[PDB]
Amino acid sequence: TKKSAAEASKKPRQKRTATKAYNVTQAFGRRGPEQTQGNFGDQELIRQGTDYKHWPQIAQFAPSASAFFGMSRIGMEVTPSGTWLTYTGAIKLDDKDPNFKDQVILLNKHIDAYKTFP
Amino acid sequence: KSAAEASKKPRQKRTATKAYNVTQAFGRRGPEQTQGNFGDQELIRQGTDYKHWPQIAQFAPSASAFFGMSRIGMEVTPSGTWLTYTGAIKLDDKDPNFKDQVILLNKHIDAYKTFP
Ligand code: NA
Ligand code: NA
Ligand code: NA
């Protein structure tokens, strides 16, 4: 059985897994433009999280823990709200992957799509 | 899993170990805009074999959280097509281990500057 929102929400934010039972908004907040918000997901992905039909083709771009700390620029920022570990980086698509073109289409479908929402 | 084997993975799915270290998997640490800056000499040489690796990895995002928390972009350039990401993970300052967590993270951030 799928974990309830009550149970899944007990994980620290960065270790949460969105599903139909605990969706992207519930886990990670509303998509939005601010520096603190995520901007990724169309309505279907938002509602289904890792249950989304094309989730594996998105997750193939998410970094391992080793790669996350190995590839990114990591910083620390202390503010009246708290202490933050900051990260930035870039992941290259493999243009020799037979599914390259579909990967671009899939990613374009989800980037900043919240701007079109009712 | 040798260097030859582990290197077959896409960069973002690599696992650094003593046999395939952070430099070999992810490049030299450095200051440039998409070079990694994280790791003292011990971490660089051992990767996920570092004995305090669990206290670092507790801050690494799941795939769901990576795509849920971050600001994601795409850039096309002479080098290819890139997925860009930025974000921030809040430490829990009510955790009694908070101060040790800050110390452990600062031990590795930009530490490359102090060695060749
Ligand atoms: Na679906
Ligand atoms: Na295809
Ligand atoms: Na780079």
TrEMBL record, chain B:
<protein>
    <recommendedName>
        <fullName>Nucleoprotein</fullName>
    </recommendedName>
</protein>
<comment type="function">
    <text>Packages the positive strand viral genome RNA into a helical ribonucleocapsid (RNP) and plays a fundamental role during virion assembly through its interactions with the viral genome and membrane protein M. Plays an important role in enhancing the efficiency of subgenomic viral RNA transcription as well as viral replication.</text>
</comment>
<comment type="subunit">
    <text>Homooligomer. Both monomeric and oligomeric forms interact with RNA. Interacts with protein M. Interacts with NSP3; this interaction serves to tether the genome to the newly translated replicase-transcriptase complex at a very early stage of infection.</text>
</comment>
<comment type="similarity">
    <text>Belongs to the betacoronavirus nucleocapsid protein family.</text>
</comment>
<feature type="domain" description="CoV N CTD">
    <location>
        <begin position="1"/>
        <end position="116"/>
    </location>
</feature>
